[PDB]
Amino acid sequence: MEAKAIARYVRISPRKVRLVVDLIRGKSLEEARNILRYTNKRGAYFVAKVLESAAANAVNNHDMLEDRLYVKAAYVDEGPALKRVLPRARGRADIIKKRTSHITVILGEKHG
Amino acid sequence: RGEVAYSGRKIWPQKHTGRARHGDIGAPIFVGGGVVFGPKPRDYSYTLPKKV
């Protein structure tokens, strides 16, 4: 049995959160929590909420046991980009892409 | 391209913009521009010989 959570349209750039996500793929729910807590990155805040919500899903909806949960899968997909103007010199206007992430955490049960 | 609503202005200078050279945006090479040899209202009738 698996349990998923997705945070869609989080305003952080995908390549950046993925760094944090990579840290907890395949980890126990317990280790992932400790890892995320002392990861000095903005993304850790977002990964944590998705992770903590999928846990809640597992326990509450899917008849899974907290003490057995581990991170079976996790990935970051790109959402639509917020496109903004960055004024450069000599009347030139650049476009900044303020990017977006769709963060998925999938939890399973480690038996035995 | 002459029947299209756009202006006849040259959209940017001929040289030194680093872009391709263009005239008005009514040109068929533009999206929204005129069309080159599209249909115009015409009469398909013709006098077939009465004997035939």
Binding site: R90, G91, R92 | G18
Partner: peptide
């Protein structure tokens, strides 16, 4: 040795 000069003195442009 001074010979011809086959190019004007250069100056930088401005893209946009």
């Amino acid at each position: 040795v001074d010979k011809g000069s086959y190019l004007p003195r250069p100056t930088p442009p401005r893209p946009i």
